[PDB]
Structures are given as structure tokens and as C-alpha cells.
């Protein structure tokens, strides 16, 4: 299988290792244990819909983000962060997503050393890192839910564990003229069983895959560890989002198709 190295980033269980729709793959104490995001990959286009937009600072007149601080460490621009850490050579040159993740992970709420590290959102639109004070992602029993949405397409959801080489080992772009397959005896075969959801465009397919992807809460017991319906083959001609839950191990050339994952950006292709 010559696809092995290339397909590694699509082994979402291995490279991400946590929930995607809802990421709560670890626990940390602050006396009391709390659930918190721990996925190793950035989630492109993921945001939180409040049923106040969620990047507003916490106060129900407030959102999910860090309250104002002195100095203001959230929200903080990329340049603001690089300046803040200008003396730290291990941090100052990190890519924007990892830096945002490390910046959020810098703020210890236990003022003893604790393992609790806030998740974050980097907004590519105005180059701002938003530390999330609230790590919750769904409450549909304040009612809210995670989603991919046009309003969120420049948002990126970042756990404390985002790896510094995510660009190399994590999905971002959708693959044009390509279909996920399974390598069997020297040939790339079709995913034998897929779940067909109609979708008007690639965005809607990406949205659907996200909705069905690995999730660490319903709607240790609940942890997905990255297992789930994380991949989709979008047939742009029949407008079918072909969703499946086993890792792909090769690509098939097919101009009718675009290959997407729950982690991938909902628009960008390569």
C-alpha cells in the first residue's frame, strides 16, 4: 500500500484521538474533576450555536469566551500573542492555531499547578485567538449545540492538545476529484457500506459529517476516542453525502467526488 504515509492524516482515531462534534476526551482537576477537550487536531469551521454569540465573554447576557483581563490576554491577535511571548523561543514562532492553543493552555485557574487547560477558538477573519472559559459544547436537554455553519467558516476549534505539526498530520482541505476507498490486494476499492445523506453542496456534506462524527457526549463511559462517522465521500453530481465510520486507506480518482472529513474545512479544496 503506497497510500500509507499519505492516508495517515485520515486515521482520525490515531491523529486526533477524541470527539469532534463534542470533544471531551480527558478529565482534569481544579479538588473537583472536570471534562475538557483533548483532540490533537484543529476542527475547521466548528462553532457553537446559542439558541449573544458564543465568542462573547461570559457575563445569560454573555457567551463562552474569557472575561476581560489586565493585560487583555483574550481575545488576542496573532501579533499580540507573538509579542507577548517574544522572549520564549519555544512558543513565539508556533503556527497561529498551535500558538492559540498554547496561549489558552498557559492560563492556570488554580492560583497549585493543575492539569486544567481551556480550549480556544482562532478566528482567521480578524486573526484573533479567543480563549474559551466554557468548555461545554452541547446542552440540549442556556441551550446550545456545536455546528458547522456559514457564520463559523473562519472559526477553528482548538483543544489544549492541538499538535504543533497539525498541518503535516491533520486534515484541512477537501480532496477534489478524489474518493476515499479501502486498499485491498493492490487496488483501491470502494467503501463497501456507506450511509447516504442528500446534500446540496460540499458545505452541507461537511456539515452532515460533522453532525454524525465522533462525539464524547450523547444527543470514560462517553469518550469516543475518535471513533465515529468521521468521513464522507461527496458526489457533487448526484448530490449524495456518502458517510461512513471506518478509516479510509487509499484514494480513488473520480471527478464526480470530493473527499471530506468532520475535521476538514467546509469550503477549501485541493
Amino acid at each position: 500500500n503506497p497510500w500509507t504515509e499519505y492516508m495517515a492524516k485520515y486515521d482520525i482515531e490515531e491523529v486526533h484521538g477524541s470527539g469532534i462534534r463534542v470533544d471531551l476526551g480527558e478529565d482534569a482537576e481544579v479538588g473537583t474533576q472536570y471534562r475538557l477537550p483533548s483532540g490533537k487536531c484543529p476542527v475547521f469551521g466548528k462553532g457553537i450555536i446559542i439558541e449573544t454569540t458564543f465568542l462573547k465573554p461570559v457575563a445569560k447576557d454573555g457567551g463562552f469566551a474569557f472575561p476581560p483581563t489586565n493585560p487583555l490576554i483574550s481575545p488576542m491577535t496573532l501579533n499580540g500573542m507573538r509579542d507577548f511571548y517574544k522572549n520564549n523561543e519555544y512558543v513565539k514562532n508556533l503556527d497561529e492555531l498551535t500558538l492559540c492553543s498554547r496561549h489558552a493552555g498557559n492560563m492556570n485557574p488554580d492560583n497549585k499547578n493543575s492539569n486544567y487547560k481551556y480550549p480556544a477558538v482562532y478566528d482567521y477573519n480578524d486573526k484573533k485567538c479567543h480563549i474559551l472559559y466554557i468548555a461545554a459544547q452541547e446542552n440540549n436537554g442556556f441551550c446550545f449545540r456545536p455546528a458547522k455553519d456559514k457564520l463559523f467558516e473562519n472559526y477553528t476549534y482548538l483543544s489544549k492538545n492541538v499538535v504543533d505539526n497539525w498541518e503535516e498530520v491533520c486534515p484541512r482541505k477537501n480532496l477534489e476529484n478524489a474518493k476515499f476507498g479501502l486498499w485491498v490486494d493492490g487496488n483501491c476499492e470502494d467503501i463497501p457500506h456507506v450511509n447516504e445523506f442528500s446534500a446540496n453542496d460540499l458545505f452541507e456534506c461537511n456539515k452532515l459529517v460533522f453532525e454524525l462524527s465522533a462525539s464524547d457526549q450523547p444527543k470514560d463511559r462517553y469518550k469516543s476516542h475518535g471513533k465515529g462517522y468521521n468521513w464522507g465521500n461527496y458526489n457533487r453530481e448526484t448530490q449524495k453525502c456518502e458517510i461512513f465510520n471506518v478509516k479510509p486507506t487509499c484514494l480513488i480518482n473520480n471527478s464526480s467526488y470530493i473527499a471530506t472529513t468532520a475535521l476538514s474545512h467546509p469550503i477549501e479544496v485541493e
Binding site: 483581563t69 512558543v91 498557559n106 492560563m107 485557574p109 488554580d110 492560583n111
Partner: peptide, 13 residues
Amino acid sequence: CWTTRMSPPQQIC
């Protein structure tokens, strides 16, 4: 109030 984990340690409120 939070405390930075990376040196230099500081208190940000």
C-alpha cells in the same frame, strides 16, 4: 484571576 504556567509566571486578573 489566572496564573501563567510558562516563565515568567505572573498573575492575570
